[PDB]
Design a protein around this ligand. Structure first.
Ligand SMILES: NCCCc1cnc2c(-c3cccc(Cl)c3Cl)c[nH]c2c1
Length: 503
């Protein structure tokens, strides 16, 4: 449910909430109001509030005195299932026991605060189907709200929109009778499960929130102008839905696989992980790599993976070989900020190296402005005729923190990557990696998915950036990490539409 996240609370408001409405073990998370990528975990212990910083520069959530995580929900899940594991600077244990729930509705897909009654009928008439709903602030009754629902068959009167008035009396919400709820979310959840019935029998089913993020490609410029004037709010609504994505990650947690993960708690989902076959028969667990298949849904596929560790380079090449991948995208330098982000896993130019049962030749490197292309030949040792060329596109100019201030470089790169993949008959998924394999990796993959829709169907197709992101996030944890990456995706799509109108 992720109610412990408070999107619009101050540091002082957070202390007071925990001191007046919480107990020892109560906690909440909140953003830093002028520092995107900064979050705070506020926790009560010993009748006093402690504040722990979480930093995200684009690769992972880094909890001070704790671990690195793919999502705040995964971070809270981990500490609510492990006593004694979160520690103060001096080393005392901080326990997260009791989430302190937020009543703020602003990050709910169905909450459209500023929106009139006829404005809500238009949207539902056009964009909505049976069971589509939204909640808006009342115009005629200050402080109250309205629930607008479409029901019918999918202009002949077969459909209709019903309005239901939501009273706010003494910080509780009701539909005119029955139960009084502490938040609009509690109210909506209750009638989502126990639908209202009109006397004459219509069931006001709340099946899905009204979709307002799906846009036609030719109107990208206007939506971006609107989000610029916010990108923040839309992003936060997306992050709220990450509690629905806590799929199991058991294989990455096995003792045998511990040291195959760059970060112990950033792990591939079981249901999409790449399973490696034909492993050394002596090796107990030989089927594991920290990598997931990303299959775009609603025909190129990807594998999103971490930067190699020295002990997983053999597994990486087993995976490229097994999957028939012919194109690799590397999203970081080898070293950034003096720290190793992905080990060198390819031979020096003109050299040949064996990586366990795999053999790799570096045929030729070519320097471009923003990237290096390495033409590699991959084959299985002892088996001459298994040789294939693998083209490695190494993007070298992404800044150490944040995102590029212009998307042309990335877009020129993806264009060239796309033409290479398309030129090779029956090529397998495009491998995209480095660092933890969720931030830049997920950003490059999302842009690539969106740009391919526009390249095939033109500027007469519909795109939905957050839906696309949620679909990739259901296949690997935390794909697209920051609000800066989120804005960068919109800017890249826009830029790609502006140069297609230049043709
Ligand atoms: N309270 C803001 C209401 C406007 C709104 C609606 N919808 C989304 C979405 C979204 C869209 C499709 C699917 C999913 Cl799962 C999401 Cl989160 C992400 N930001 C949004 C913002």
């Amino acid at each position: 449910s992720r109610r412990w996240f408070h999107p619009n609370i101050t540091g002082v408001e957070a202390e007071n909430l925990l001191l007046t409405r919480g107990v020892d073990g109560s906690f909440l998370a909140r953003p830093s109001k002028s520092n995107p990528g900064d979050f705070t975990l506020s926790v009560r212990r010993n009748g006093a509030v402690t504040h722990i910083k979480i930093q995200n520069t684009g690769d992972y959530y880094d909890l001070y005195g704790g671990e690195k995580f793919a999502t705040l929900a995964e971070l809270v899940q981990y500490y609510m299932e492990h006593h004694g594991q979160l520690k103060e600077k001096n080393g005392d244990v901080i326990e997260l026991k009791y989430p302190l729930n937020c009543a703020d509705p602003t990050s709910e897909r169905w909450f459209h605060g500023h929106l009139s009654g006829k404005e809500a009928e238009k949207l539902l008439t056009e964009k909505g189907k049976h069971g589509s709903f939204l909640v808006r602030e009342s115009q005629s009754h200050p402080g109250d709200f309205v629930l607008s629902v479409r029901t019918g068959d999918d202009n002949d009167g077969k459909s209709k929109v019903t309005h239901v008035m939501i009273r706010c009396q003494e910080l509780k919400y009701d539909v005119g009778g029955g139960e009084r709820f502490d938040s609009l979310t509690d109210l909506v959840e209750h009638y989502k499960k126990n639908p209202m019935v009109e006397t004459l029998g219509t069931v006001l089913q709340l099946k899905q929130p009204l979709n307002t993020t799906r846009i036609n490609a030719a109107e990208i410029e206007s939506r971006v102008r609107e989000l610029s004037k916010g990108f923040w709010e839309e992003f936060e609504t997306l992050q709220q839905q990450e509690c629905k994505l806590l799929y199991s990650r058991k294989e990455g947690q096995r003792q045998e696989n511990k040291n195959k993960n760059r970060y112990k708690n950033i792990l591939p989902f079981d249901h999409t992980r790449v399973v490696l076959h034909d492993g050394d028969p002596n090796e107990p667990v030989s089927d594991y790599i920290n990598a997931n298949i990303i299959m775009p849904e609603f025909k190129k596929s990807y594998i999103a993976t971490q930067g190699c560790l020295q002990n997983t380079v053999n597994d990486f090449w087993r995976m490229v070989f097994q999957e028939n991948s012919r194109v690799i995208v590397m999203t970081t330098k080898e070293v950034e900020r003096g720290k190793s982000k992905c080990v060198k896993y390819w031979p020096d130019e003109y050299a040949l190296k064996e990586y366990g049962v795999m053999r790799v030749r570096n045929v030729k490197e070519s320097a471009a402005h923003d990237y290096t292309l390495r033409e590699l030949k991959l084959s299985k040792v002892g088996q001459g005729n298994t040789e294939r060329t693998v083209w490695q596109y190494h993007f070298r100019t992404w800044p150490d923190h944040g995102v590029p201030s212009d998307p042309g470089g990335v877009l020129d790169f993806l264009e060239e990557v796309h033409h290479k993949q398309e030129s090779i008959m029956d090529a397998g998924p495009v491998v995209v990696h480095c660092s933890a394999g969720i931030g830049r990796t997920g950003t490059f993959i999302v842009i690539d998915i969106l740009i391919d829709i526009i390249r095939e169907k033109g500027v007469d197709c519909d795109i939905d950036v957050p839906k696309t992101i949620q679909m990739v996030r259901s296949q690997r944890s935390g794909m697209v990490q920051t609000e800066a990456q989120y804005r960068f995706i919109y800017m890249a799509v826009q830029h790609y539409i502006e140069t297609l109108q230049r043709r």
